[model samples]
Target chain A: GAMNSSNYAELFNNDIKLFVDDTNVYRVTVHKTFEGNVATKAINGCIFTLNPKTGHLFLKIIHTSVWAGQKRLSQLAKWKTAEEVSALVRSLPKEEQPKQIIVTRKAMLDPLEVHMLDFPNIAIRPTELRLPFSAAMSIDKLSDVVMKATEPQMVLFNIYDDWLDRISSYTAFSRLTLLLRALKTNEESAKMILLSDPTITIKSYHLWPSFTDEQWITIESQMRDLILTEYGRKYNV
Target chain B: MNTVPFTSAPIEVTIGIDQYSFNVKENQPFHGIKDIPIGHVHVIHFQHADNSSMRYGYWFDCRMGNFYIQYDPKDGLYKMMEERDGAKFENIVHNFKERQMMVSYPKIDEDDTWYNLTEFVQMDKIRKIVRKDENQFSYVDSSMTTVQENELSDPAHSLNYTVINFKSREAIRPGHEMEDFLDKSYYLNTVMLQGIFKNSSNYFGELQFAFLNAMFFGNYGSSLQWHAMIELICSSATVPKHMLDKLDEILYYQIKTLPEQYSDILLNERVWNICLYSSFQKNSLHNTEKIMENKYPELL
Candidate 1:
């Protein structure tokens, strides 16, 4: 699961620039670009991805936000802190930068959240130590309006919490089915991804057990049909 | 975990980006009480420091009158406008920034202190200040409310237009657990939401807020309120260390000794739910950060 040099070069090398180096502990790497002739003198842990169309690099600050150098994707140069990132961006050609820049206020070391995909799938899991601040609507009201919609749209349920691990596959299937049916009846097209721990790791992981292939098929078929009818595509499993 | 029986129709309410609103039934008694009415109008505008813009803000129990908003800049503490404060507390929003309604209590008097918000909402009048919008998805409200169009994302093209529905007779009934939840979770939610808006104007998606909200609610019931408070302290990184420590003392004491305090009374399921949630999840989770034992080891 730990992304190594081979996979890094093989997967991202063509499309986006990546820099890989051995941290004193785990060979941490930065992406978009690495500074140095050997590219060894670059930042560690922070992994970045650039939008091919926008050139805006999504620099994911890993393990910490206060990096020795906050690296920019365009220049391949790293800044000392978030302030430096701003300063360097100001110095760069204005066209090469994004209109809005997102920077983490602090280096989250022990975030309350734990993303299992932190390892192999670290590429996609934008995990934060704590939940960021945001305006929240009352669930009572939010769900009310959502179920009333008549448009052919996508509604995803990332049921990856330890709570799901406690229910049987049938119960899980039933709940999802009932939910989907309700949405389907409302003429709603939905795609729900039921993510589980990659392993039996948590307070109640054992309770989750596993779903049978047949049971999964039944769930998948119905989901695929709804998605296809509206989206005309696979569930992107 | 019984399906909390209900027949209330889906009533949609929406709290816009900065605007707050409460949808209520005129007949429904405040917090299910027989006589007292919980008024339906709740609007407080948290004006910006620059006085550039403002919108109506909101909180629970529309029928019981406003839970006058107040904040003490000296201690970074927000309080409820109290009766003893007289005319100074009038115009809750203006006093909010003016620091006119500020009421700072001694650290030791927190437990015994009977502030107006808690007293008015929980005791003098029973009311349910339903949250119009939350970043977390753990709340179990069977009723329906509309989502503000701009609340979620992409001002240009909106793909995630949703009308969510709740399936429960979700109201804050009169009980120790319910009040505690209101006391802790409401303030915590209020504080957290303020933090979110203050930090950035960047739009967040429904999924992210729903997930965090779910964590706050945990497994529903009494545990729901306690866990909400617990998450604010134990789980939040944005919370200040000193304030976190202050809350840690209050919460740890409440969660640990709360159930015992009412052992002789005929407590309701809500109270029991709080105790159970605390025992099952709240305390069960490793509290390696034991502020109580560390600070007042003699008391322990």
Candidate 2:
């Protein structure tokens, strides 16, 4: 197996297996339909994805879709945003800077999306969302001052909404929960298999980047189908 | 460092610093229905701070998500990029193929209101009518919605972003609930999700602990709230599909990918017990079989 240069071109050409990385580089368009049902996979649909594109799976949806999800997703929010609670906090001492806030998502397939459509959903694929770095921050005392709010109740969904006003503005947290969950479980076995099977192991830095385009594409394609499948060919997209 | 490989494992394991050091089988291997082995199924693999082996925070933790802000002692900033943004997170999901994940954020001023949280809720008439909590009392009139049969569908507009916000506060707590408790972040995130679910209907029961991802495609805005192509998974649903006609397609290209992640499976109980198990090797179904036997009696 060492330096078989005699058949280099043939072997080199044959050895290359193409794939698309699951994590991709995409542009944010801010115009995907905000409708519950994502359009079908026709050429014009918002269904851009990957299938075995690289060593790492890379599937990218239009940023228009991302913004759309954000714009219309208030239906799924947890608390009144920092924008909602500024009055009382802003009325307080100037030293009371904004506290850190957070946003979270839970993927639930629409019953209709599950029963009537061919949309990309958890039924077809396991669904997930990307998050920003700020929402993950944590805090202690809100600037050492707890100013009481008069009309406290209308603060809405999250209990911390009002209390969060006096805290810092740009703190963040990590999404390491699930990632570590996946790694911890597989690490034991993975570590063992890696020694004898150097062929299967991937490089550290190359984990997110450098995936063969083919590999990334195939994996993403499968994921997209899986989400649609989970939605059970149902109502909305 | 011990140059001699740490070979004395109570069990065998794969050792790679990162995902590039690994290779996926031709496609994820799937055993026929009858091929279900006699062990615990590998439902999924994701990093979690709660897991004993982890020396650092993960995508599932309050810390890792905010590497941009909070300064951690075990700074996985580089690792975070690789794990959250780079190939690390991508490779696992790619190879496994349950594939819908994105990481994003939203930037509303300090004045965004709680009533706005109801944008996705399909709630009932009297939700705020009978609440006793001081917090609930103040926000009771924050614009309630009708809870529909299953209105939790349009999630992720700012799901992870909110989580980031809440956890951003929770992240700095001295004796953080997440680090102290096994499922605190899981519980907190689930609780925080109420803003979305409480919007209309509470059909989304409890959020299960699973490998999750949030993805944004194309040029996204740096505004915490300004990106495109955002989507999130509320539950651990479905597996790879089987039927060949339904098997292959493309971004205009090829054949079916292995092991499908289906949403509505035929069997009722099977819905809960997915054949999610997998191994680095070709036939890891044996591992899955054990999980099935241990978790679900009839499935085996």
Candidate 3:
């Protein structure tokens, strides 16, 4: 799906423009018009129409609101020095230091959403080495790229995440919300609330924010003892 | 999936509107038990499994002390009546006298007839012709006089008679003062009564108030304008957003547009000036916007 000179005309043509902005390895190209050029609505709607939950599952993974960003990652790096010097684990290898993934408010502008359509989908940049998921893309991100894809640029995504390959079992959020069996399960089973909510977590601390010690204890009991162990975290919601 | 026994599902689909999760402002997540009594509009949809297409049931106007029916089985969409929960229909009409109602119901298999307004009324061509009426459709529409009887009479012979004559009030009633005639003035309905498709709004309609400066200038002024305002409010489509916007502008300006004397009646109103068509809710809109921002913060 890598482009040649044949796609040069498409890059400059059409009012319904399309562009792909990615975190690269060496150099970064942040085009001002690039963000405006992309037909984001059409692709997002397509994803929603095709699969609501899986679409949302993919959305949640890179979703800036749920997780930390490059800016936040950089801020968390302040703790990295403290982590390397004073906080050494007992069993882990010497070189395998706990990676400090700092996220900041500035990273909010970056597209947590991935569109698979004709995009210049590139790899994580070397400049963004401080980013958490810089080494490789996550499955959720890749799946999102496909649904987020625009037309004529279906070739935008060169590689497919191992997860997209599916048959009956690979029901998108679209099917999960509407399927008769899904409805039946919701009707007869517990609440429709999803797995542990997408909360604001302080990744540097590996826990939720704005919670007291008592609240954190309650959360640990719910997340560790009660929820994960007892029920296996089915998205009741 | 079992339709025969509704109890297996226990909760009705109405209880849990899929895809949509209702979270009231300041309240915990929608408990469903506590919230619904106040009233809310519901749009019922059936999704075709194959194409993920929606078949919408006509709008259901749900309110307390109003004539309404269940939205799910929109059986009453096209009909005056329905088979499902016939009790609800009868109870609704009988329970409240001021309850104005309209419902959309579907016809079941028996669509073997069609009729227009003519099928419901009689015609009197002879009386119309003698009256010098312009056309046949005049009975249903506005009356516009084409030719006068005096014009036709003068074609062959000399005719000198006024078709319409105005007599002075003093002449008609020799002793009555001019003020008497003014007090008794009235407009007549110039048509035969037939089809009883009478009115759509029940009870009374809202009256119009002209606001100048900040407050409504006239507490009592034009009678015609008052009647026109009533008709406008009663017949106006209820748009949720429009009404919300109107209310917001009213509160923001802090101007007494409804007037000083009338504020007691119009200020704290249950008969809210709402456009049912506008899809907005003051409490709900703010919360949902935040929820969406939680998803896509870039919109900021």
Candidate 4:
């Protein structure tokens, strides 16, 4: 069975976004074309569009006038087969000319493949997400992959930002809590996590009000204990 | 005190064929305990006016002791008489003697050879006259200044003497020896001394032994020496009780400052070896082992 387009879109949203000018032709066209037809998300500074009819995902890439202008004539000569189309477009004034547009098809992913693609930045990939799993199971799998990847520091930052904006999912909160507990056991990761800005770590993350008062108190106490433990170990005090 | 006549009759002293004559003048009658030994060989103390004293050289014959104007043959008679102002006289006559009267003195025995009074008094065997608080004089032997074992009770004194001895040994070395090496060793000794003094309880013999080891053999060139120090605390039977106690205290202090897991491992090894082979008291060892096992159960 195929995965739903919306589910793929949700998974695509988990990855990073590409930053592009809205005036760029590719970004403008993709946004206008997919406004109501299907779900769209920004990914790796590009527009990731899901075609609901075929369950296919497309990513739009834009090149500025500098790059396009440099290779325009050679590209036009190479595309002699599309001579009329290229001639008509090139016959227009430079200001009205379109920037180069390229669209790439992303590989179709199963539900399990989506979980594999979830933590792309981590060096070690998890293999157990081959079957359809519950949200809690996916979270646990992702947390395990993150712990194996030794990326608690970055994961914690993402969770902290999500909690601050009130957009934290169960997976985010669970991973955050799991990574916090894991830091108690792994001093190397705890040391790295402590090296980040104390304003973001000790101050804001510990002071966030999203969790219950008791939960926040426990988290804050654990964080303090981790910091003191790391500190004492570091300086041998 | 007794009195003695300060004035003596004119005596004729001859050197070679020339005769030299001198007379003694009395400023006041010499006041002293006459013929008393002054704790020096062939010397007597003559007290003059104003409570001043002089050590006059004498010649002791087989049966009698005499105050002699012994002259260095090289020095003229007039110059010698002028320097001895306690026996100073007004005038001296120097002339060539014509009549050769056979004047001979008794043959001196081998042991009665005259010695230079200044050099003879300076010999180590001569007793030094020390003044006592009770207005009396006492004889103190020169060997009394040597250090005694009991005098090492004071830590400052011990350290000072050790440094002095170390520097004296280093001083006689040829200049070509590496100075920085010597300086580094010197610094090691200084730091070790400081550590020992700070940590050790006041056990003089132990402190002295530690200082001696540091002065002679301690350096950063090897880690074995430091481990040897630890092993000495662990294995030696003759080590003092307080010395081992202090060493254990220092080790515990170091353990406390270490990381938790590492401290556990360190404590396990230390307590294991300390309990296994140490000559420390059985009760203390058992107490340490029990406490350590309680703290780190893996030691079991």
Could you give candidate 1's per-residue lDDT for residues A1-237 as a string of tens digits?
Answer: 223333322322233221111111112344444444344332223222223221232232322323345444322122222222333344457455433222222221111011111122123212221211110111122233333434322222223223244654335434443434434432333323223334422233221224555655664666555545554333443
N/CA/C clash count, model 2:
269
**If the candidates were sorted by their lDDT against the true structure, best first, what order would they fall in?**
4, 1, 3, 2
Model 4 over residues B89-132: C-alpha lDDT tens digits? Answer: 21111110122211222223462222211222222211111222
Which has the greatest TM-score? 1
Native-to-model Cα distance after best TM-score fit, residue B112 in candidate 2, in Å: 38
Two-chain complex of model 4, DockQ on C-alpha atoms against the true structure? 0.01
Q: Which of candidates 1 and 2 is the stronger one according to DockQ?
A: 1
Model 2 Cα interface RMS deviation (Å):
15.1
- In Å, what is the interface RMSD of model 4? 36.8
How many Å off is the CA of B216 in candidate 3? 39
Interface RMSD of each: 15.3, 15.1, 40.4, 36.8
- Please, what are the lDDT tens digits per residue for candidate 2 over residues A27-46? 22244466764442211001
Lowest lDDT 10-mer window, candidate 3 chain A?
A: A45-54
lDDT of 2 by residue, B1-300 (tens): 000011111212221211111221222232111111112111111122233232221111222221111122363211222124544433443443342221112223462222222212221211122232222111111112212211433221212222322223332232332231212333223443344444212322111111111110110111111111011121212212321111111100110111123211211242223322221111223343444455445543
- The parts of candidate 1 lying over 4 Å away from their true place are A1-79, A93-237, B1-253, B257-300
Model 2 chain A lowest lDDT segment of ten: A135-144
TM-score of 2: 0.14
TM-score of chain A of each: 0.19, 0.19, 0.16, 0.21
lDDT tens per residue, model 1, B42-151 = 22222222322222222234333223333445633222332334344243334333533222211243443212112212211111112323211111221212233235
